[PDB]
From Swiss-Prot:
Protein's name according to its UniProt entry: Villin-1
Subunit structure: Monomer. Homodimer. Associates with F-actin; the association with F-actin is inhibited by tropomyosin.
The family this protein is said to belong to: Belongs to the villin/gelsolin family.
Gene (name only): VIL1
Cellular compartment(s): Cytoplasm, Cytoskeleton; Cell projection, Microvillus; Cell projection, Lamellipodium; Cell projection, Ruffle
Residue numbers of the full-length protein present here: 763 to 826 of 826
Post-translational events: Phosphorylated on tyrosine residues. The unphosphorylated form increases the initial rate of actin-nucleating activity, whereas the tyrosine-phosphorylated form inhibits actin-nucleating activity, enhances actin-bundling activity and enhances actin-severing activity by reducing high Ca(2+) requirements. The tyrosine-phosphorylated form does not regulate actin-capping activity.
Domain (HP): residue spans on this chain: 1-64
Expression (tissue specificity): Specifically expressed in epithelial cells. Component of brush border microvilli.
Headpiece: annotated segments: 1-64
Lineage, highest ranks first: Eukaryota, Metazoa, Chordata, Craniata, Vertebrata
Species of provenance: Gallus gallus (Chicken)
Length: 64
């Protein structure tokens, strides 16, 4: 699993995204610290939200 800075995951062109990042699950590529800062809940709690809600939260945060 490759992790990248929040700014890189948010501000990179699709074709320029590092090969090791799943574009549909950018949150998995954030460090634990960045995930905590961005979402404010544990990774498990976030994964337990309906998919559409995970997506909606990510849209405004630039991670969709």
């Amino acid at each position: 699993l490759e992790t990248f800075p929040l700014d890189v995951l948010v501000n990179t062109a699709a074709e320029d995204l590092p090969r090791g990042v799943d574009p549909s699950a950018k949150e998995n590529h954030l460090s634990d610290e960045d995930f905590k800062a961005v979402f404010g809940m544990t990774r498990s709690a976030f994964a337990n939200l309906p998919l559409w809600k995970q997506q909606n939260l990510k849209k405004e945060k630039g991670l969709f």
